[PDB]
Design a protein around this ligand. Structure first.
Ligand SMILES: CC(C)=CCC/C(C)=C/CC/C(C)=C/COP(=O)(O)OP(=O)(O)O
Ligand SMILES: *C/C=C(\C)CC/C=C(\C)CCC=C(C)C
Ligand SMILES: [Zn+2]
Lengths: 407, 323, 6
């Protein structure tokens, strides 16, 4: 019809999705209300301006921001001086999503830089001279796989990498993030990711890891950092993804996990929150929404007959609307929410989430949903590694040619 | 000594007591990627840090230098490691170090390294006497700080400091009944003390949660807690629950109440309840109201629940194809 | 704050 508003967030009924504080104001409700009001303005801007809304992914703007950042950053990034392989990964992945080629000058320089970050005893550090750590090790490997050249693959010292993983492994099945460091579910995921990609997984490497991870699932259905802690999207993603890599998703109560993650999508904003009663945030477009593709694959593997064959169990349209309308910086780059400043981390995760929301795949079945102008479509991303599915296949195949360290 | 923010702060390359050392510039390679244009202060401190680390100089000045390197980038785990090496080698007073870490955490509470360092100090000292109060102060500024709650769970568990936590949980729940971290803590304390098997405890818990639900019908946390503490034994195992929820329907509805009802029906259906069909239809009706009107953001999930229930509980579900 | 993931 003519009166029909195609954008879900702009429909008149949508206003009914506003927070109901039951007249009991608390810090949580007050904060949530502030966000909704700010987001309501974004939604209503077209109406008050008397313009027909057109949702455009500012590709050219994002490309400039990325292209320059891959080379040089301001002192605003001093807080990430111990996370440079992450800067490499976040940027290269964003470019990959936007379907921008990586010139060999760049690829070769990234490789050489990443090898300067590699430790003499395995793993990668946050910068040259820094001790290895599982987070930048995960980032570096992903970054080299996105490049995917013989050079890129060759940078990784696999025997030392395996030695490194073992030096971090704990008796209870967990892993330290680095020597003398902290333990939480992120380490299990970082380790499984790099180990699977490089084919260095030995029979006992992940002994007890699945059980340890399963102990992190709590009464909420989600997964916390360590056993006993509140369920959170970053940890839940790490947990399920690591379990998927280890082929042990079944250790979890997938049903309660599914109900928890689906409940994390904000009825009004359309984006996802990190934990119950906290605020919406663009990066969770990946951490939270990325769980649906994983849960779909797990449930389907159990022969679940009620599974949809064209959509994920989340409102794909609403997430895309949230990202497109509220998470883009006019100058390029993406963000947490309106009012927040852009950064490469949110740029990487908002785009990753957008891609997830646009593409549904289940074997032969394929179905896209591209909100706004058709040029908004991005390249697909693998739900476990968050790098191109083709890069995953290429990397694994290449590493399967080599024997698991020690044979 | 000289704070990083002191108006009279001087670069290390301009300090006489550091004249013997040659700062080590960062090895970024001939053509850098993701190169950060560090400020002069940052680069100066780190060049000297590289120098001391490289030569493994376990000295008092190196120790003082790490404080500055940390203030410039508290996320630099390599600096924290070297500082811990220096603490042991130089035989530094750990209570003084505890004083330092509490100040740092106060200013940058959402950092992994600071909480880990404090944990190491506590372990080394085997003294948790300052923990709960310290954490309480951080939680008083951000009642949902993840690291703070995680550290609190570790302290309480490792040192068995359970006695006053439920009281603390009740206090915070009063301040903000919507605080999910506090509900999670409540579950943590009960699971590790009396447990939820004790009928008196469970009952008390459920009464309390239902009362909070009555006061703030739309607070998702209470709803999640109630489901979380009953779901394991099975929702259908508690026959009165259903009637009681149905009673809140008029003056206390929410997509939360309606969703819970579906969870009860789902379980009833799995534990061969009476009127199988009567129940299944009630459930599918709610799934439809949810997907279509009361909770459309989750339409895909609700439609799936509807298909799952249909698929396994319809009168035809057990009937052979030939019939 | 700064970066809360690591
Ligand atoms: C592989 C890898 C390193 C994954 C990391 C995933 C991730 C996003 C972790 C963040 C966890 C965390 C401490 C959140 C609290 O920050 P907050 O209180 O500022 O945010 P919130 O209110 O959204 O929870
Ligand atoms: C996890 C990493 C994040 C959130 C990115 C941190 C970086 C910044 C914050 C830099 C901010 C820069 C400007 C406002 C120009
Ligand atoms: Zn974020």
């Amino acid at each position: 019809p003519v009166w029909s508003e195609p954008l879900y967030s702009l429909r008149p009924e949508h206003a009914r999705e506003r927070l109901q504080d039951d007249s009991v104001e608390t810090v949580t409700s007050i904060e949530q209300a502030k966000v909704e009001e700010k987001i309501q303005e974004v939604f209503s801007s077209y109406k008050f301006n008397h313009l027909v809304p057109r949702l455009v992914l500012q590709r050219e703007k994002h490309f400039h921001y990325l292209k320059r950042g891959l080379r040089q950053l301001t002192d605003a990034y001093e807080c990430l001086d111990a996370s440079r392989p992450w800067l490499c990964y976040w940027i290269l992945h964003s470019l990959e999503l936007l379907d921008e080629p990586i010139p060999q000058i760049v690829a070769t320089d990234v490789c050489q830089f990443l090898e300067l970050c590699q430790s003499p005893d395995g793993g990668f550090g946050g910068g040259p001279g820094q001790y290895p750590h599982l987070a930048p090790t995960y980032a570096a490997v992903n970054a080299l796989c996105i490049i995917g050249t013989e050079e890129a693959y060759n940078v990784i010292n696999r025997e030392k990498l395996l030695q490194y993983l073992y030096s971090l492994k704990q008796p209870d099945g967990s892993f330290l993030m680095h020597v003398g460091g902290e333990v939480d579910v992120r380490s299990a995921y970082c380790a499984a990711s790099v180990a699977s990609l490089t084919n260095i997984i030995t029979p006992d490497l992940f002994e007890g890891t699945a059980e340890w991870i399963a102990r992190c699932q709590n009464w909420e259905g989600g997964i916390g950092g360590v056993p006993g802690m509140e369920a959170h999207g970053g940890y839940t993603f790490c947990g399920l993804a690591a379990l998927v890599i280890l082929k042990k998703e079944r250790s979890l109560n997938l049903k309660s996990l599914l109900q928890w993650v689906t409940s994390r999508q904000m009825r009004f904003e359309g984006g996802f929150q990190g934990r119950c009663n906290k605020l919406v945030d663009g990066c969770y477009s990946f951490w939270q929404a990325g769980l649906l593709p994983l849960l779909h694959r797990a449930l389907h593997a159990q022969g679940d007959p009620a599974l949809s064959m064209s959509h994920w169990m989340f409102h794909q349209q609403a997430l895309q609307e949230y990202i497109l309308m509220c998470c883009q910086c006019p100058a390029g780059g993406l963000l947490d929410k309106p009012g927040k400043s852009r950064d490469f981390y949110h740029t990487c995760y908002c785009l990753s989430g957008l891609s997830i929301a646009q593409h549904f795949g289940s074997g032969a079945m394929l179905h896209d949903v591209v909100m706004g102008v058709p040029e908004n479509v991005l390249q697909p991303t693998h739900p476990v590694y968050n790098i191109g599915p083709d890069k995953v296949i290429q990397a694994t195949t290449h590493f399967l040619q080599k024997p698991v360290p020690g044979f | 000594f000289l704070s990083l923010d002191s108006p009279t702060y001087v670069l290390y390359r301009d300090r006489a007591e550091w004249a013997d050392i040659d700062p080590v510039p960062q090895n970024d390679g001939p053509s850098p990627v993701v190169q950060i244009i560090y400020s002069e202060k940052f680069r100066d401190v780190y060049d000297y840090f590289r120098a001391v680390l490289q030569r493994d100089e376990r000295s008092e000045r190196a120790f003082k230098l790490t404080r500055d390197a940390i203030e410039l980038n508290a996320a630099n785990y390599t600096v924290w490691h070297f500082r811990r090496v220096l603490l042991r080698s130089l035989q530094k007073d750990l209570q003084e170090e505890m004083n330092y870490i509490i100040a740092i955490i106060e200013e940058q509470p959402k950092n992994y390294q600071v909480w880990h360092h404090r944990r190491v100090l506590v372990e080394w000292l085997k003294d948790p006497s300052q923990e709960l109060e310290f954490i309480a102060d951080i939680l008083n500024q951000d009642a949902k700080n993840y690291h703070a709650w995680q550290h609190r769970q570790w302290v309480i568990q490792e040192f068995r400091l359970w006695d006053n936590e439920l009281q603390y949980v009740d206090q915070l729940l009063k301040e903000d009944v919507r605080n999910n971290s506090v509900w999670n803590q409540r579950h943590f304390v009960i699971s590790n003390t009396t447990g939820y098997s004790d009928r008196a405890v469970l009952e008390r818990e459920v009464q309390y949660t239902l009362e909070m639900i009555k006061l703030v019908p739309h607070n998702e946390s209470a709803w999640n807690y109630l489901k979380g503490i009953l779901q394991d034994r099975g929702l259908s195992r508690y026959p009165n629950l259903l009637n009681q929820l149905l009673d809140l329907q008029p003056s206390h509805s929410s997509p939360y109440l309606i969703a819970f009802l579906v969870d009860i029906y789902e379980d009833m259906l799995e534990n061969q309840c009476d009127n199988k069909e009567d129940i299944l239809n009630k459930a599918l009706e709610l799934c439809e109201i949810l997907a279509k009107e009361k909770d459309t953001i989750r339409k895909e999930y609700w439609r799936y629940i509807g298909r799952s229930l249909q698929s396994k509980h319809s009168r035809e579900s057990d009937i052979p194809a030939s019939v | 704050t700064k970066c809360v993931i690591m």
